[PDB]
Amino acid sequence: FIRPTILRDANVYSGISSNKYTLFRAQQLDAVAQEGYATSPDRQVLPEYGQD
């Protein structure tokens, strides 16, 4: 399956990138809350959008 998605201007391309940036960030923060539970390992997380 192929699902194209067209970005006509920049503002649509932040939101599209921000939801993958955050869904990836939110996935790292989910993996921390299991590694935190297990103790003695580190998964390190991407900051928030635009904070570097």
Binding site: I2, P4, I6, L7, Y13
Partner: protein
Amino acid sequence: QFTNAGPGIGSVAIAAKDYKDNGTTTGLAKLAENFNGMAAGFYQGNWAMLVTALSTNTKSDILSTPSIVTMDNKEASFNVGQEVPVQTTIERKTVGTKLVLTPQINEGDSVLLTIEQEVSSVGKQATGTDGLGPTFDTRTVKNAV
């Protein structure tokens, strides 16, 4: 005696008679190497009986979603896979999850996508071939949609 079965009563009996008085185990240990199932022997007086059974039943699920953002009418490449040598003196081939796509935009909505993609693999990095170079399991589709 039959063959569809894992092993033949021949190798088994000979091995058991060769394993007597602290004998060898190479012969018999080589038969029983790949065997898989329930081999159940039974002696009722003089008739010997050997019952063989295994059901192999398997399951695999694969799902790859390699996305990419390109300018219209430029071909993007996207690879996540690897360069392995192939004979022809050798050569490098990029086999992994590949998406090569040159999108083209209808003024309004609908994208024309020229796709050449495949999911390919060198089987096992520690396995050979009946041929001469490496082999590849590929799932490919090149089309415009």
